[PDB]
Structure formats: C-alpha cells, structure tokens
From Swiss-Prot:
Effect caused by changing residue 225 to A: Reduces methotrexate uptake. Reduces methotrexate uptake
GO terms for cellular component: apical plasma membrane; basolateral plasma membrane; brush border membrane; plasma membrane
Bilayer topology: Multi-pass membrane protein
Purpose: Antiporter that mediates the import of reduced folates or a subset of cyclic dinucleotides, driven by the export of organic anions. Acts as an importer of immunoreactive cyclic dinucleotides, such as cyclic GMP-AMP (2'-3'-cGAMP), an immune messenger produced in response to DNA virus in the cytosol, and its linkage isomer 3'-3'-cGAMP, thus playing a role in triggering larger immune responses. Mechanistically, acts as a secondary active transporter, which exports intracellular organic anions down their concentration gradients to facilitate the uptake of its substrates.
Gene: SLC19A1
GO molecular function: 2',3'-cyclic GMP-AMP binding; antiporter activity; cyclic-GMP-AMP transmembrane transporter activity; folate:monoatomic anion antiporter activity; folic acid binding; folic acid transmembrane transporter activity; methotrexate transmembrane transporter activity; organic anion transmembrane transporter activity
Outcome reported for the amino acid change (mutating residue 20 to A): Reduces methotrexate uptake
Resulting phenotype, residue 315 to A: Reduces IRF3 phosphorylation upon cGAMP stimulation
Keyword Isomerase: no
Description of its domains: Has separate binding pockets for folates and cyclic dinucleotides. Two cyclic dinucleotides can be accommodated in the binding pocket and they are likely transported at the same time.
Region of interest (Required for substrate-binding), ranges: 346-358
Protein name per Swiss-Prot or TrEMBL: Reduced folate transporter
Length: 398
C-alpha cells in the first residue's frame, strides 16, 4: 500500500530529471551566430577540460557518494546541472566555457550513484523488480528529452536562446523535486574484500572483458564527444531549424534500447564465442568511424547521421554482455569496486589520448585528422582481438 507511493515517486524523479531539452544542442549553440566562438577554440580548448576534470573529480565523488547518504549527492547532481546550464547561458568568454565543462564533468560523474541508491533503499527481496522499473523509467526519460527538444525546435522554429531558457525551468523543477526523496537508512561502504578480489581475478573470462572495457570505452567516449563538432564542420547551421542533432540522439537511444534487449536473449548462448564477437563488432565500429572521417560532401549529411547512430547502437549492444560476464563471478559488495577501478583506468587512458591528439601544447590536430587517427586506433583494436581469437582457436583444434 504505502510502498507503491515511493515505488512510483522514484521512477517519477528519475524520468523528470532525465528531461534536458538543450543538452543535445549545446554544441551548435556554442558555434551559433550569437556567440563569437571559433571552431578550433572549441575543439582544442573547451573539450579537453572535460576529459581532465572527469578524471580529477571521479574518485572523490564516488567515495563521497558511498560514505555519505545517497540523497545529498543525488541533489548535488541536479544542482551541478543547474550550474552548468547557468554558465552556458551566461558564458561570455572561453574561460567561462572551460569552467562550464569542469562543472559538466561533475554531473557526468554522478551517473552511477542512482543505481546504487535504488538498491540501497529497496528491500533486497524486491530489488530486481524496482531496479528494472527504474531502469526503464530513466531510459524512457533520456529518450523523451531529446525528442521533446528537437521537435520543439524543428516545427516550433524556436530560437536557441529560447530553448535553453525552457530547459532551465525543467532543471529547476528537477532539483526541487529531487530534494524531497527519503534518504536511505544505512548504506555505509576488511581482508575479505582483498581475498575475494584475488580469487576472482584468476578467472580467465573476466580479464578479456575488463581490457575491452578499459580501452574500447575510452575510444567510444572520445568519438561521442567530438562527433557533434564534426557534424557542425560538415554543414554550416545557417538556419536553426535545419540542424537535426537531437533526432540523431533519439534514434540512437531507441536503437540502443532495442539492441540491448536482444543481448539478454542470447547472452549465455554466445558466451562460448566472445573474442570473435568482439572482433566482429569492433571491425564495424572502426569502419563507421572511418566513414565519418571520410565524408566531406555537403549533401551527404543524411548518410552521416545514420553512420553515427549505427556506431552508437553497435557500441550499446556490447555493454550488457560485458556487464553480465563481469558481474557473475563477484558479489554485489565487490561489484561496485570492480566497476569503479575499471572506469578510473579507462579515464586515465582517455586523458592521455586527448592530451596528445587534441590539447594545445601538443599535436593539437583539428577534428578531421583527429577522427582519421581514431579510425586507425579502432582498426588496431579489432586486429588485436582477431589475432587473439585466432591464437585461441589454433589450440582448440589440437
């Protein structure tokens, strides 16, 4: 009876807090006529700050989340979103945008906490059902936010400044609603952990997916960041309505949802073949990145959108299999630590790559050549996986 109230309120909060209309149109706004911003300044100055601050912030945020009650950090996430949008709206120079990226990194870091909070509050026996409902709610919110913003701009023909003004109200309501949710009673954080980690580490199947999560995730995140600037490069946004950035986001979200559903269907049945599966998916990802790099025609933008959504769906499909394969050996207590270390290593790799290719006082290449290099990086990853699979197969015959 009383349980239903919280059960629905949590889903409502998640869905409402996923409603950001202007998130997907941030990049075109930075390059819009109203702001005297050059493209190379955006690619070389603004974005690397995001990567640096993500690595700087991540571990303290997670440690604070676990030590403190989840509600304070969950509220801080919404407050940081509010600060990000305020800075973006009133940004007047490049340093302001750098600070904005720093503030957005904090919001990015807090993503993981909410899944832990739901596990914390809900009774253990009923956890699965509420967790599935919450995941459905948050995914639906993410899918609907971009659709709402893109449809508002496309047929409404509203200006960019108006769109972010509309977004700010939703963010304010999100934080105000976020304030109320009840704090979990007791979820605070030991040779047992070390012994369990040592025992599990010896498992063969885990290492492969761990390495994949380390490298391929960093590559995918770099591509996800820079894609928008590449899109702006391909075609000038002379008219606000013409741009279709949000629609690509919504289609990618839907394709990711459908493909993620598929993974569960045959997650166990494809366990035997994993290196070959990784190679097959990585090859296509590399090919899509190369196609994104090589497309320069003004009228080929439509094909470019399909390339990016296909690449995002291809990456999304692989995630559930990795999560299931990693999770099984360990326990809930150690799952969060196993995942945490992985993300920290991945962010370190991404920081090194981004500081080399794109940061000033370095190679500092423009977006085009940067994507051309990322294509080679993904191709190398795919070749490594194929060689490993062939080496494994060779013994199998004997």
């Amino acid at each position: 009876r009383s349980w239903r109230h919280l059960v629905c309120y949590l889903c409502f909060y998640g869905f409402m807090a996923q409603i950001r209309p202007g998130e997907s149109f941030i990049t075109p706004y930075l390059l819009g006529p109203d702001k005297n911003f050059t493209r190379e300044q955006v690619t070389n100055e603004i974005t690397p700050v995001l990567s640096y601050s993500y690595l700087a912030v991540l571990v303290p945020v997670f440690l604070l989340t676990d030590y403190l009650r989840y509600t304070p950090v969950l509220l801080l996430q919404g407050l940081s979103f509010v600060s990000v949008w305020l800075l973006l709206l009133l940004g007047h120079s490049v340093a302001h945008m750098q600070l904005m990226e720093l503030f957005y990194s904090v919001t990015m870091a807090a993503r993981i906490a909410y899944s832990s909070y739901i596990f914390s509050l809900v009774r253990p026996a009923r956890y699965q059902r509420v967790a599935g409902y919450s995941r459905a709610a948050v995914l639906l919110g993410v899918f609907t936010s971009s659709v709402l913003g893109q449809l508002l701009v496309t047929v409404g023909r509203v200006s960019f400044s108006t769109l972010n003004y509309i977004s700010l109200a939703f963010l304010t309501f999100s934080v105000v609603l976020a304030l109320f949710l009840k704090r979990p009673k007791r979820s605070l954080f030991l040779a047992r952990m070390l012994r369990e980690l040592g025992d599990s580490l010896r498992r063969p199947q885990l290492r492969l997916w761990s390495l994949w999560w380390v490298f391929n995730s960093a590559g995918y995140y770099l591509v996800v960041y820079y894609v928008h600037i590449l899109w702006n490069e391909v075609d000038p946004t002379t008219n606000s309505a013409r741009v279709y950035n949000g629609a690509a986001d919504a289609a990618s979200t839907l394709l990711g949802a459908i493909t993620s559903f598929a993974a569960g269907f045959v997650k166990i049945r494809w366990a035997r073949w994993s290196k070959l599966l990784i190679a097959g998916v990585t090859a296509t990802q590399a090919g899509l990145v190369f196609l994104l790099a090589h497309t320069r025609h003004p009228s080929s933008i439509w094909l470019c959108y399909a390339a990016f959504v296909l690449f995002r769906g291809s990456y999304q499909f692989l995630v559930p299999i990795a999560t299931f394969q990693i999770a099984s050996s360990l326990s809930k207590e150690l799952c969060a630590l196993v995942f945490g270390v992985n993300t920290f290593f991945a962010t370190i790799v991404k920081t090194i790559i981004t500081f080399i290719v794109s940061d000033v006082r370095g190679l500092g290449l423009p977006v085009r050549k940067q994507f051309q290099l990322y294509s080679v990086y993904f191709l190398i990853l795919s070749i490594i996986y194929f060689l490993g699979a062939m080496l494994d197969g060779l013994r199998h015959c004997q």
